[PDB]
Design a protein around this nucleic acid. Sequence first.
DNA 1: CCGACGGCGCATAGC
DNA 2: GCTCATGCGC
DNA 3: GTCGG
Length: 327
Amino acid sequence: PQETLNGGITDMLTELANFEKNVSQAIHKYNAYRKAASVIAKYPHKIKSGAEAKKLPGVGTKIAEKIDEFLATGKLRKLEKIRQDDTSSSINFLTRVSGIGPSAARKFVDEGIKTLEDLRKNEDKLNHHQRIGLKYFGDFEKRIPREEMLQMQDIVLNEVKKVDSEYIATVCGSFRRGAESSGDMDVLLTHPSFTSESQPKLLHQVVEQLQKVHFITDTLSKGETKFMGVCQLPSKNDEKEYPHRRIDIRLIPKDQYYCGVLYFTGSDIFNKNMRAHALEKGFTINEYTIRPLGVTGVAGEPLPVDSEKDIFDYIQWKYREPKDRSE
DNA sequence: CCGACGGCGCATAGC
DNA sequence: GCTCATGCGC
DNA sequence: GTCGG
Ligand code: NA
Ligand code: NA
Ligand code: NA
Ligand code: NA
C-alpha cells in the first residue's frame, strides 16, 4: 500500500511513538504505537473512521479516537502542542545521536544543551560513543544502497578469510533477504575453534585486520563476542567520499551459528511465525538453540544444528530461502 | 483489574 | 580496587 | 496503549 492511503495516520502514530520513547520513557507505549502504525500501514484501504481501524489488532479505543480527530481536522492537538514545546522537541531530537538515549537527552536539555551545536561545544560532557554519534550524525541517518553493501560484503568476506580461512562469516539483516537498501551491516562470525563447550582473540583479530586495511574507522564498543563500530568504503580516487556506515560483528559458537543466522536474517515477523509454529510441534527456538519440549513442557537438550534447513526439518517445514522470509 | 509487552553484550553508583 | 544497576542499541 | 488472563 502507498503512503497515499493512510500515511497521515501512520506518520502521526510514529511521531507519538517517538515522544513516548524519547520524552515520556514509556517503551511499551512506543511499541504499541509502532504496532498500530505498521498494521495500519499494511491495510490496503484508505481508513474512513476510527471505528474501522479499531477492528485491526493493536489499534484500540484511544488510537481510534485519535484517528477520528485527524480525519475530521487534519491535525492532532496533542501532537501540535508537543511539536512546539521547546523542551520536548529538543529532548526528542538529541536522541537521534547514537549513544544519546532518553536519559542522556533529558540531562543535556536540563542544562541548556539543546542542539548539535551545543553538543559540539560541550564535548567534555559526551562519552566515546556519543562523540562518534555526534561526529557522524548525518551519515548514520543515511541509507545504504545494495550495491554499496555488496562492495562492503566483498571487503569483509575477503579480509576475514585472509586472517583465517576457517572462519565463517555471513552478512544477515534485510540485506541477506534481498533488500534494495539497508541501514547498517550485521556480520555473524564463527570458527571451528569456538563452541559452547570450548580463544578470546577470534573477534579481535578480524576487527584488527579490518582496521589495518582502513575499512573500520571507529569503535563504539568491543568485547569478546560483540563489536559495534563504523566503517567506510574507500573513495574512488578523484571522487566524492562515501558516507561512514554502522557495522556490527558478533562471534557465535559454531553449534549455535545457524540458529543465530536464522534469527538475525529474519524477518522479525517471519521469526515469530516460525517460533509460533515450532511450539505447536513441541520445540522452542530462540537466538541460540532449538530444543524439544516434554509433555509437561520442560525443555530438553538442544538438538544438533548444521544448516538453516536442519531447523526447518525439525519443525517439519519446507526450507524457505531468505528471499521468502518477509513473513 | 492488572500485568506483559524481548532480552542481552558492552560501557559507564556504591562498597 | 571490585561488583553491578542503569543506560543504550539492537 | 492494547491485549488478555
Ligand atoms: Na483492535
Ligand atoms: Na535513537
Ligand atoms: Na540515540
Ligand atoms: Na589456512
